Amino acid sequence: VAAERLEPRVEEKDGYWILKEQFRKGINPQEKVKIEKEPMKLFMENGIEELAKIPIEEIDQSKLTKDDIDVRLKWLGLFHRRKNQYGRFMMRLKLPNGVTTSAQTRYLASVIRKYGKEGCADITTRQNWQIRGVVLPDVPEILKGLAEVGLTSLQSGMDNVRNPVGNPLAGIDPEEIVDTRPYTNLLSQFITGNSRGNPAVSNLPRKWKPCVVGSHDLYEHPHINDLAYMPATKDGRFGFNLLVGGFFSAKRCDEAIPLDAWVPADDVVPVCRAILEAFRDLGFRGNRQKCRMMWLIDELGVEGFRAEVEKRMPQQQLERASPEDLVQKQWERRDYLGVHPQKQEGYSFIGLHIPVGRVQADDMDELARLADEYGSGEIRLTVEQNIIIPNIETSKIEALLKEPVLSTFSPDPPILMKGLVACTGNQFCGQAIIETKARSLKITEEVQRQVSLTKPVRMHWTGCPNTCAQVQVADIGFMGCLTRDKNGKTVEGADVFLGGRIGSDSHLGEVYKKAVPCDDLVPLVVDLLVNNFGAVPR
Numbered sequence: 001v002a003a004e005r006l007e008p009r010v011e012e013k014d015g016y017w018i019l020k021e022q023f024r025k026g027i028n029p030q031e032k033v034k035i036e037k038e039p040m041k042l043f044m045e046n047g048i049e050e051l052a053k054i055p056i057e058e059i060d061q062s063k064l065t066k067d068d069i070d071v072r073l074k075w076l077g078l079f080h081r082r083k084n085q086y087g088r089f090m091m092r093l094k095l096p097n098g099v100t101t102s103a104q105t106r107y108l109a110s111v112i113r114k115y116g117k118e119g120c121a122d123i124t125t126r127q128n129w130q131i132r133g134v135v136l137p138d139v140p141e142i143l144k145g146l147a148e149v150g151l152t153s154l155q156s157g158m159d160n161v162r163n164p165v166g167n168p169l170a171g172i173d174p175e176e177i178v179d180t181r182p183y184t185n186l187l188s189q190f191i192t193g194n195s196r197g198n199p200a201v202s203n204l205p206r207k208w209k210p211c212v213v214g215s216h217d218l219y220e221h222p223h224i225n226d227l228a229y230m231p232a233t234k235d236g237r238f239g240f241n242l243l244v245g246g247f248f249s250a251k252r253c254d255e256a257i258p259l260d261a262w263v264p265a266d267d268v269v270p271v272c273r274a275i276l277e278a279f280r281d282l283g284f285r286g287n288r289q290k291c292r293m294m295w296l297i298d299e300l301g302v303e304g305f306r307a308e309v310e311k312r313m314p315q316q317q318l319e320r321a322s323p324e325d326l327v328q329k330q331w332e333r334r335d336y337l338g339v340h341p342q343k344q345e346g347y348s349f350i351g352l353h354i355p356v357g358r359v360q361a362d363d364m365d366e367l368a369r370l371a372d373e374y375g376s377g378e379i380r381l382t383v384e385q386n387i388i389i390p391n392i393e394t395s396k397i398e399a400l401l402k403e404p405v406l407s408t409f410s411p412d413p414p415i416l417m418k419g420l421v422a423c424t425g426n427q428f429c430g431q432a433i434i435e436t437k438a439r440s441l442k443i444t445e446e447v448q449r450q451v452s453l454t455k456p457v458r459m460h461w462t463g464c465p466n467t468c469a470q471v472q473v474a475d476i477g478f479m480g481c482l483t484r485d486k487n488g489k490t491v492e493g494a495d496v497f498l499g500g501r502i503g504s505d506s507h508l509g510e511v512y513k514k515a516v517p518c519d520d521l522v523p524l525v526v527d528l529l530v531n532n533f534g535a536v537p538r
């Protein structure tokens, strides 16, 4: 690699970071949008106030403003559902470590409630909240309301740092390695500039995902993150070994690889900054499918990339990885649904199943009520789109289990439901090829009616090749497609994936059978479960 390849391609100009004039040739259309107007100005210079007053029909009449609502607003966590819910916006938060409060939950519920049939909310595969139904004129007030309850939606979509994922059992599990909350909190504060915006990390070549590991279970899925912090002692000091480059895409799925770097615990933010600066400064900005950070690592080689991180560390120091980390390979992933004792004597947490992560305003209020009556007003989200309510005095559990809402959001649903994960799908998502959430519930219910089993089989349903529901991690995965019935009629289908493993012995699954009509999946899945997962016909 020539020395010229290492010239930073962006520069700071008036508080924002822009592509240098000599690096603008051949860039993709999204890069052109970012050059035409800095997206962060919508928040940091309050551009949203005037934009929100323009009728959407007028907005659509000029490229600049249409790009504002369809592209730039994703820097404020707002996602125009142009195709499938025209004029409405999904809104996505920062929620480091999946931690929310009852007050925040009620606030989000009050927002979606206003929108009636156009509103609802979802737990995401990054243990995050999305709300739906938002209209542009309400955006300024919603931004204010979020801030009032201690939430931000900054930099949650497009070419930004995604929600920092941590251990859902952080601080409460007798078996945790290290509480991940302080680190995910710090990362979120760094990324968003303490909820004011951080332009230094908002003009990346592409999305970028971080997680901090604190569980032997590896609930955080470090193998699929762009940066994963693996807890490790080195020379008698606590810190993290670093894995880099994990990502999924239609084109390519790759597990994270060692950077061959260890940092002391206090260097979590400095090294996040150094890696992001290297990616920002040096990453390809052509074909969007070749812009994720792993592509830069392949171009420079991992050592070449490492040197770029190192030069951007304070005092330009970056130690090599510790030979061992603290994660025990002898481990069985633990079910967190149901009632479990905390490390604090006399306290329990309860994991509740949220069917395909979907909730209405009334459901959110009820969950918030439970967290107040039984817990400490805290609700935690998980990457399987479930919830945990921690800090419940154990003597209260008997009463809790009798609460009517637990018949819907159950501490002990059937085993296949426990592991079921599904993306948004075509109810709202314009990329989706099929409907996912309703279909996956229906099929899973029919399958479980036919077979019993004891193995915790994890089924993931994703609506298109973007694989937001991570079919490549599933025991059985379903990727949306259109296919044909016996008469040659167009029908919704799924490509079925097998072979995904999580935890320390991770592995990426691959397509096993293409183009199966959705109406034909039940017998296929029943047979797979009996033949490969020890299921028994009822």
Ligand code: SRM
Pocket: 079, 090, 092, 122, 123, 124, 125, 126, 127, 128, 129, 130, 156, 157, 162, 163, 207, 209, 224, 246, 247, 248, 249, 250, 289, 292, 422, 423, 424, 428, 429, 430, 431, 466, 467, 468, 469, 470
């Ligand atoms: C909500 C969520 C799925 C879910 O039901 O939980 C989702 C939703 C969408 N994703 Fe994603 N992604 C979700 C996690 C993921 C993950 C999984 C993960 O992070 O572990 C991936 C695969 C892992 C990865 O990217 O490395 C993922 C891969 C993408 C991709 C493909 C990325 C690529 O490099 O090609 C896009 C489209 C793109 O960027 O080209 C996409 C684009 C989208 C958009 C924003 C497209 C759009 O504007 O319509 C989806 C919004 C639909 C909607 O209305 O909800 N989404 N997306 C997840 C929100 C996470 C969060 O809170 O931030």
Ligand code: SF4
Pocket: 423, 424, 425, 426, 429, 430, 431, 432, 433, 462, 463, 464, 465, 466, 467, 468, 469
């Ligand atoms: S996998 Fe496809 S259909 Fe599902 S939310 Fe992501 S982009 Fe939409």
Ligand SMILES: [Cl-]
Pocket: 074, 156, 157, 158
């Ligand atoms: Cl996005």
Ligand SMILES: [Cl-]
Pocket: 080, 081, 082, 083, 084, 429, 430, 431
């Ligand atoms: Cl759309």
Ligand SMILES: [K+]
Pocket: 353, 354, 355, 356, 357, 384, 385, 386, 420, 421
């Ligand atoms: K769920």
